[PDB]
């Protein structure tokens, strides 16, 4: 059981359609648990998973105060970065930040993360030592100097090693029936002729959690990496995930093909064939 917590912030300017929108979401592994949106009728931190709802008024207020302050801070940062890049006010831009902590399985701080981006390009990241910064360009160097002056890295290290980890463990215990439960994929193999001489074998995995899974096709026991059409893992909407992998095979050669699935929730790895 290897777990993580992450917060994802998106700050987006929109001239002249009002002030930049700030939205924060928090996740434990593949489960979202909180959101904040500066655009909501009444901006407040809101629960998005049942196990967080037991947190009391003081938690909710604490969160909301931080995200409100961040709303104002990010609007200034957007102004600053527009300045650093000599950009016009025209002119819509995005700052993103993702930070958090990884635990081992095991249960102690494996490593911490804090990364920011500007218009979808790396801008500034906290190094794995949690003590120094990697700035992408001369603009991000300005941010770096400001962040050094305010001793941000030191504050982050203290959070990533302390609170981040402590609260992740509390969430894992509170939501243990779901967060610490791996649901194995339900699997099957479909067959659809494409022409007289070729057919598609599709290996399906449904209903699994967490999202991490490996689906491969083999011909005579060797990987078919270039020939496998692999779909991005997708949410079912009920916390579970879906994925498939397809190969096009010469008709008559179907039995030479095997599908292999690895997922934490499985007693042991699966080997599947098309079963006529």
């Amino acid at each position: 059981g290897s777990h993580s917590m992450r917060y994802f912030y998106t700050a987006m300017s929109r001239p002249g359609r009002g002030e930049p929108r700030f939205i924060a979401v928090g996740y434990v592994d593949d489960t979202q648990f909180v959101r904040f949106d500066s655009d909501a009728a009444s901006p407040r931190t809101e629960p998005r998973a049942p196990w967080i709802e037991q947190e009391g008024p003081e938690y909710w207020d604490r969160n909301t105060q931080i995200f409100k302050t961040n709303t104002q801070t990010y609007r200034e940062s957007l102004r600053n970065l527009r300045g650093y890049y000599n950009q016009s006010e025209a002119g819509s831009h995005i700052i993103q930040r993702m930070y958090g902590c990884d635990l081992g399985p095991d249960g102690r701080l494996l490593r911490g993360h804090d990364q920011s981006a500007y218009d979808g390009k790396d801008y500034i990241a906290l190094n794995e030592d949690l003590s120094s910064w990697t700035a992408a360009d001369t603009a991000a160097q300005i941010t770096q100097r400001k962040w050094e002056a305010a001793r941000v890295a030191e504050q982050l290290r203290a959070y990533l090693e302390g609170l981040c980890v402590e609260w992740l463990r509390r969430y894992l215990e509170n939501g243990k029936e779901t967060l610490q439960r791996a649901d194995p994929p339900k699997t099957h193999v479909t067959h659809h002729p494409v022409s007289d001489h070729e057919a598609t074998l599709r290996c399906w995995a449904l209903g699994f959690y967490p999202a991490e899974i490996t689906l491969t096709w083999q011909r005579d026991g060797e990987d078919q990496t270039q020939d496998t059409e692999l779909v991005e893992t997708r949410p079912a909407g009920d916390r579970t995930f879906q994925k498939w992998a397809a190969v096009v095979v010469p008709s008559g050669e179907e039995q030479r093909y095997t599908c292999h699935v690895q997922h934490e929730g499985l007693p042991k790895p699966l080997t599947l064939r098309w079963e006529p």
Partner: peptide
């Protein structure tokens, strides 16, 4: 719980 310090970039 989120990081409690905000700092302008």
């Amino acid at each position: 719980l989120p990081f409690e310090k905000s700092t302008v970039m």
